[PDB]
């Protein structure tokens, strides 16, 4: 699914994936997913932006990208890619992005720092601090750094010669205010590339001079300013990454031009092995971070341009669907079916065929259809009661006209409950034609040569009434048993096959309308989202027939 | 510090407050805090909280109190004289804040209060959601309301036109309106209100409470998406910035 | 066009702007109002939007992430004629060379009408710009400004 | 609303408050409002205003009360429990 409709995208094989404070803010829970810009909320993951590795054909590249960057492969937009120069091993190229990107985007694109003016860089130890120092010194301005400890001061002084001993302070306490106000003759600095918060933020705001630009990397106090002409710039690189307007291209050009010069250069790096995510994030939380932090996905190879070879990564299997395929949810217009379809569309399905008996009947179905189509999916609702070869052929024709068929999720049911002592043939026929006839026809038509190599999600929703029994519901039981046996036969014979036996789904079903507490055989009515998570696990595991039930407090 | 002592016993009037369940926990609705601030301002000004138009602005919700299954709880209210900066808190943890005032005629701005005709009936069933489905959606999200808070009788597919059942209690009505607002933003994550922008209540224009034998009153309500403003009967809620929550499985592990 | 106009007097421009712009919001809000109108104007700014406040407390509590608030006080720039002042002079001169800039509506007021001029400026019924005619222009386009005596209290 | 009733009579202790004149008017000094808020916080916390360290922040002065030449004045104090947002006001 590496093909993206928007623009042209290039799939890069990551070699060294960086980690930023943003990734910790997201993983910890301080920053909710929904707070991310539209375009990053619908994405797969949300961790890591910087990356560096071989592009297609192997030419070493680096840059920012969509959130799913801290990964073994990233689909970049072809606009966020800088070529790695020589004399720069990939271990080093992973440090230039985000660091220098934010430095330039704050000081130049928005700060508009000019020859002169005074730039106060908080937390000069962090990679952004060093990048801002490099850029500011490139423009020639006087830079007041605020290091936290004393080792950072020595390291920075040894990394930048021209810095004197009067251009340093202590960020830990509110002493930098006194030093800056005393050394600058009380005028105050102009460009405050602030990164602190709380009382320190108030102190930093009380240093800004007239026509001063406060570049807040992380505002309430600022509004009550008394310096007249000023400016407050909230700098959130995520929004820029998402909305790649002309400004993004200008920033790319600035960073590339700097790279051509000797201005930008790799910062302190701390390579961490792959299976050390928890420790890496914990250390990033601690604050003792040694400069930058990276993760070594793959070891670099000798040749400077070559194919990235092959490698397999251990990972918990998720369930995703091909956006270019079409999936049929027989009886998907009921209670469960609609929510299964919504979950599917979230996971990537864009072409659906929600089959039902009579079609749209109530308003809830129409609202759900409208919402799913609003997510950008093709829902061709039919009303084909699959009972003969022609009906199934028409269903498959609709599916193919949508696109190649990939899966069939049979969710139909018929509840003619009655004790066998007083059970009529009509009830049995009506109940089995909802599971047995439809299932048999779909199986026969989905194993044909034209669809077999494209089908991977044959699924049949069953109920525990075939495993644990329900009084006087033998039709449901016979149907479920047949479906489970068919799926076992399928798996034995190859091709996908699955039969999920449910206990009782809450909310959507009639039990939810009457109240999602009624107990049946001691089985509490299961929630929905939990049901969906269990389904997510079940769809991607090699077992023919499975079951899931929630026990009730005895 | 006009302390309010709510009770949730069987015979107490506020038993209905146990119907506002969010994932198997009896949370005290934010509408409750709003009504409490309303009553506090009314009392502090020598007025009755059934004939005083009010406007709550800049409202922010900090925490959600867990109502006892049976017992009583204490919640204090501290408003300032001039700025009307209320602070509804309990024990040591603040519940809600913002400003509360009493404006003049210029209180409601939607005009749905004046409207009295519903027109929602005589619309094809395929284009109208009944109470059952309207609250099926919300229970699916995670809000499991009891019968007393199920204060929506019908809705449109657009989620804009709807009918509310006014039956005396103000908290039920306000939470019905807020439910309309939540319904206006589909999804699958348990949305949690945090910050409002303007909640204007005008009890005068509102229809009088039904007597016991007069069943309910059907009130039309509309949600304007341009400004994102939900207005029903005599209330008008606006803003409703929200965050997400990680749900809480009500049962034992599957 | 006729869709690009609103009513500043009341808080209706918010509805019109949000309806006509599809809810995204404008980018550069050259705001000049204050009070509740300022809150309404702030609630229109879009992502990466620059609020140029010609006259801020509400803005700090924004929810649009990447934004910018620029207090514009021309007095400070006039006083501190840095490089920016020269760049601005160059911009205005270059515009003048083109047909872009052009005189606006003017209401010449005699010399001894300061009180009335300022009162009218206070009223809000000001007809475009307001000027004071110190001396009548002469025919020649380059000449000495002659002589003239003005009544004034001696300091 | 811990109201304070100041008196400026001859024998009252607060006669000295008439010494804070600003251009021939006996203005009630802002330090007076600060001390009153201090005492209000001390009282609300069951403390004495002579042994309680205090910090007043974001303080802003709106008006200046004109002390009567002889008589008494009333000034109310309204502090919030959590945020400690005091409001020293008189009359309206």
HEC string of A106-140 equals HHHHHCCCCCCCEEEEECCCCHHHHHHHHHHHHHC
Rounded CA separation C4/C60 (Å): 28
Question: Are B136 and A513 within 8 A, CB to CB?
Answer: yes
C-alpha gyration radius of chain C: 21
Beta strand A378-379 pairing with A405-410: unpaired
Instruction: Tokens for A71, please give them.
Output: 């990964």
Instruction: Tokens for A513, please give them.
Output: 């309308």
The 3-class secondary structure across B64-131, one letter per residue, is CCECCCCCEEEEEECCCCCCCEEEEEECCEEEEEEEEECCCCCCCCCCCCCCCCCCCCCCCHHHEEEH
Question: Are C76 and A210 within 8 A, CB to CB?
Answer: yes
- Those of residues 153-212 in B touching chain C at CB distance below 8 A are none
**B133 vs A504, A507, A508, B123, B164, CA distance in Å?**
19, 10, 9, 16, 15
Sign, CA dihedral A448-A451-A453-A456, equals negative
Q: Is B44 left (phi over 0), alpha (psi -120 to 50) or beta?
A: alpha
Rounded CA separation B252/B235 (Å): 40
3-class state of residue A430 by DSSP: helix
Instruction: Tokens for C141, please give them.
Output: 């386009």
3-class state of residue A224 by DSSP: helix
Angle, helices B131-141 vs A363-374, to 10°: value is 40
Residues C40 and C59 sit within 8 Å (Cβ to Cβ): no
- What is the residue whose two structure tokens read 């309207």? B134
Residues B171 and B15 sit within 8 Å (Cβ to Cβ): no
Rounded CA separation A406/A457 (Å): 6
Q: Looking at the complex, does the CB of residue A360 fall below 8 Å from at least one CB of chain B?
A: yes
Rounded CA separation C90/C73 (Å): 19
Query: Between the CA atoms of B23, B26, B27 and B30, what dihedral angle is there, to the nearest 10 degrees?
Result: 110
CB nearest to C60's CB, from A110, A222, A239: A222
Residues C69 and C53 sit within 8 Å (Cβ to Cβ): yes
**CA-closest candidate to residue A485, choices A493, C141, B196:** A493
Chain D residue with minimum CA distance to B96: D82
Sheet containing strand D88-89, edge to edge, reads D4-7, D72-77, D88-89
Residues B152 and B164 sit within 8 Å (Cβ to Cβ): yes
Q: Which residues contact A524 (CB under 8 A, 6 or more apart)?
A: A504, A517, A550, A551, A552, A553, B251, B252
Chain C residue with minimum CA distance to B224: C15
Q: Which residues contact B95 (CB under 8 A, 6 or more apart)?
A: B28, B33, B61, B62, B63, B64, B65, B75, B88, B89
Rounded CA separation B68/B74 (Å): 11
Q: For residue A361, how far is the Cα from the chain centroid?
A: 36
Rounded CA separation B180/B184 (Å): 6
Nearest-CA distance A396 → chain C (Å): 39
Instruction: Tokens for A286, please give them.
Output: 């601690």
User: Which stretch of DSSP H or E encloses residue A232?
Assistant: strand A230-234
3-class state of residue A485 by DSSP: helix
Rounded CA separation A211/A191 (Å): 9
Please measure the distance between the N-terminal and C-terminal CA atoms of chain A and give it in whole angstroms.
Answer: 48
- What is the residue whose two structure tokens read 């109190």? B65
**CA-closest candidate to residue A522, choices A549, A495, A499:** A549
Residues A103 and A135 sit within 8 Å (Cβ to Cβ): yes
Residues B25 and B154 sit within 8 Å (Cβ to Cβ): no
**Burial of A422 from C-beta contacts in 10 A (0-12 / 13-18 / 19+):** exposed
Residues B52 and B185 sit within 8 Å (Cβ to Cβ): no
Chain B residue with minimum CA distance to D78: B80
Q: Looking at the complex, does the CB of residue B128 fall below 8 Å from at least one CB of chain A?
A: yes
| CB-facing half-sphere around the CA of C23: CA atoms within 13 A | 5
Nearest-CA distance C97 → chain A (Å): 27
What is the DSSP secondary structure assignment for residue C139, as one 8-state letter?
A: S
Q: Which residues contact A393 (CB under 8 A, 6 or more apart)?
A: A445
Q: Looking at the complex, does the CB of residue D13 fall below 8 Å from at least one CB of chain B?
A: no
Instruction: Tokens for A72, please give them.
Output: 């073994």
Rounded CA separation B27/B251 (Å): 18
Instruction: Tokens for A435, please give them.
Output: 């599971």
Residues B196 and B240 sit within 8 Å (Cβ to Cβ): yes
Instruction: Tokens for A350, please give them.
Output: 């864009």
Residues A499 and A487 sit within 8 Å (Cβ to Cβ): yes
Instruction: Tokens for A536, please give them.
Output: 């997510």
| Residue A94 backbone phi and psi in degrees, to 5 | -70, -10
In this complex, whether D and C touch, counting 3 or more CB pairs under 8 angstroms, is no
Question: Are C18 and B241 within 8 A, CB to CB?
Answer: no
| Residue A400 backbone phi and psi in degrees, to 5 | -65, -45
Beta pairing partners, B89: B76, B94
Sheet containing strand A271-272, edge to edge, reads A16-19, A293-296, A271-272
Angle, helices A336-347 vs A363-374, to 10°: value is 0
Entry field: residues in chain C:
155
Beta pairing partners, B66: B27
Cβ-Cβ contacts under 8 Å between B and D: the total is 25
**C25 vs C8, C13, C45, CA distance in Å?**
17, 12, 5
Question: Are C72 and A229 within 8 A, CB to CB?
Answer: yes
Q: How many CB atoms lie within 10 A of CB C18?
A: 19
Entry field: residues in chain D:
92
Q: Which residues contact A193 (CB under 8 A, 6 or more apart)?
A: A106, A107, A111, A119, A120, A121, A122, A128, A132, A215, A217
What is the DSSP secondary structure assignment for residue A411, as one 8-state letter?
A: -
3-class state of residue A304 by DSSP: coil
Nearest-CA distance B109 → chain C (Å): 11
Residues A241 and A104 sit within 8 Å (Cβ to Cβ): no
Residues D74 and D19 sit within 8 Å (Cβ to Cβ): no
* Residue C14 with chain B: CB contacts under 8 Å: 227
Query: Between the CA atoms of D9, D11, D13 and D18, what dihedral angle is there, to the nearest 10 degrees?
Result: 40
**C44 vs A220, C21, C38, C132, CA distance in Å?**
19, 10, 10, 38
Residues A340 and A368 sit within 8 Å (Cβ to Cβ): no
Residues A58 and A83 sit within 8 Å (Cβ to Cβ): no
Nearest-CA distance A223 → chain C (Å): 5
Q: Which residues contact C111 (CB under 8 A, 6 or more apart)?
A: C132, C133, C134, C150
Beta strand A189-193 pairing with A118-122: parallel
- What is the residue whose two structure tokens read 């509004």? A223
Residues A93 and A60 sit within 8 Å (Cβ to Cβ): yes
Q: Which residues contact B248 (CB under 8 A, 6 or more apart)?
A: B23, B24, B25
Q: Looking at the complex, does the CB of residue D79 fall below 8 Å from at least one CB of chain B?
A: no
**CA-closest candidate to residue A76, choices A85, A63, A58:** A63
To one decimal, the resolution in angstroms is 3.5
């Amino acid at each position: 699914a590496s093909s993206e409709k928007g623009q042209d995208c290039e799939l890069c094989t990551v070699y060294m994936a960086g980690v930023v404070s943003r990734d910790l803010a997201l993983a910890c829970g301080k920053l909710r997913r929904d707070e991310l810009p539209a375009g990053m909320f619908c994405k797969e993951g949300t961790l890591g932006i910087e990356f560096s590795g071989r592009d297609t054909k192997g030419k070493r590249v680096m840059g920012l990208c969509a959130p799913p960057a801290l990964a073994s492969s990233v689909l970049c937009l072809r606009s966020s890619l800088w070529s790695v120069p020589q004399h720069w091993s990939l271990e080093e190229a992973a440090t230039v992005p985000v660091a220098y990107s934010t430095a330039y985007y704050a000081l130049v694109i928005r700060g508009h720092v000019r020859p002169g003016d005074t730039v106060l860089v908080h937390a000069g130890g962090s990679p952004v601090g060093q990048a801002a120092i490099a850029v500011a010194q490139s423009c020639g301005c006087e830079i007041f750094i605020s290091t936290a400890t004393d080792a950072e001061t020595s390291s920075l002084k040894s990394m930048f010669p021209r810095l004197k001993d009067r251009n340093f302070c202590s960020c830990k306490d509110a002493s930098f205010e006194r030093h800056v106000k005393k050394e600058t003759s009380g005028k105050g600095v102009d460009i405050i590339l602030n990164c602190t918060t709380g009382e320190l933020l108030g102190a930093s705001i009380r240093l800004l001079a007239s026509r001063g630009r406060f570049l807040n990397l992380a505002e309430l106090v600022f509004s009550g300013s008394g310096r007249r002409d000023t400016s407050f710039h909230d700098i959130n690189l995520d929004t820029l990454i998402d909305a790649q307007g002309p400004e993004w291209t200008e920033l790319t050009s600035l960073v590339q031009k700097g790279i051509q010069s000797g201005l930008v250069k790799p910062l302190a790096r701390t390579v961490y092995a792959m299976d050390r995510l928890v420790d890496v994030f914990k250390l990033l939380e601690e604050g003792a971070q040694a400069g930058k932090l990276l993760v070594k996905i793959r070891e670099e190879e000798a040749e400077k341009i070559t194919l990235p070879a092959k490698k397999t990564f251990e990972a918990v299997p998720r369930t995703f669907f091909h956006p270019a395929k079409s999936y049929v949810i027989v009886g998907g217009l009921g209670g469960f079916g609609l929510e299964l379809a919504h979950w599917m569309v979230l996971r990537g399905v864009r072409k659906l065929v929600l089959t039902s008996r009579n079609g749209i009947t109530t308003g809830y179905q129409t609202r759900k259809i409208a919402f799913l189509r609003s997510l950008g999916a093709d829902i061709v609702v039919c009303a084909v009661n699959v009972t003969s070869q022609a009906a199934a052929d028409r269903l498959v024709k609709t599916a193919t006209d949508l696109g190649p068929l990939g899966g069939v999720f049979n969710l139909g049911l018929n509840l003619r409950d009655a004790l066998l002592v007083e059970q009529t043939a009509e009830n049995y026929k009506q109940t089995l034609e909802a599971k047995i006839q439809t299932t048999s026809l779909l199986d026969g038509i989905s194993r044909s040569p034209k669809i077999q190599p494209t089908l991977d999600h044959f699924v049949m929703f069953s109920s525990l009434s075939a495993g644990h029994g329900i009084p006087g519901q033998t039709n449901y039981g016979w149907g479920n048993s047949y479906m489970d046996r068919l799926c076992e036969k399928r798996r034995a014979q190859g091709l996908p096959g699955l039969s999920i036996q449910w206990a009782s789904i809450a909310d959507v079903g009639f039990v939810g309308t009457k109240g999602n507490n009624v107990v049946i055989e001691g089985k509490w009515p299961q929630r929905m989202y939990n049901c969906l998570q269990v389904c997510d696990y079940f769809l991607s595991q090699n077992r023919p027939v499975v079951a899931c039930h929630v026990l009730a407090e005895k | 510090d006009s302390s309010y002592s709510i009770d949730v016993s069987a015979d107490s009037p506020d038993r209905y407050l146990l119907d506002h369940q969010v994932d198997g926990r009896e949370l005290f609705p934010a509408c409750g805090c709003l009504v409490l601030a309303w009553k506090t301002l009314a009392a502090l000004n020598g007025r009755d909280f059934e004939q005083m138009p009010v406007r709550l602005s800049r409202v922010e919700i900090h925490q959600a109190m867990f109502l006892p299954k049976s017992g009583s709880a204490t919640v204090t209210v501290s408003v300032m004289p001039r700025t009307g900066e209320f602070q509804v808190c309990e024990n040591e943890n603040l519940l809600a804040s913002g400003f509360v005032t009493c404006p003049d005629k210029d209180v409601l701005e939607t005009s749905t209060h004046a409207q009295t005709r519903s027109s929602l009936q005589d619309r094809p069933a395929t284009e109208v959601l009944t109470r059952d489905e309207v609250y099926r959606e919300l229970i699916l999200r995670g809000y499991e309301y009891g019968p007393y808070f199920q204060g929506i009788l019908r809705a449109s597919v657009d989620g804009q036109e709807s009918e509310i059942t006014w039956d005396g209690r103000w908290v039920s009505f306000m939470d019905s309106v807020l439910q309309m607002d939540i319904l206006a933003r589909p999804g699958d994550y348990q949305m949690l209100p945090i910050k409002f922008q303007s909640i204007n209540i005008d009890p005068r224009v509102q229809p009088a409470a039904p007597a016991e034998d007069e069943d309910v009153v059907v009130l039309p309500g509309r949600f304007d998406p341009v400004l994102d403003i939900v207005s029903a009967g005599g209330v008008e809620i606006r803003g409703l910035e929200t965050i997400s929550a990680s749900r809480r499985l009500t049962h034992a592990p599957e």
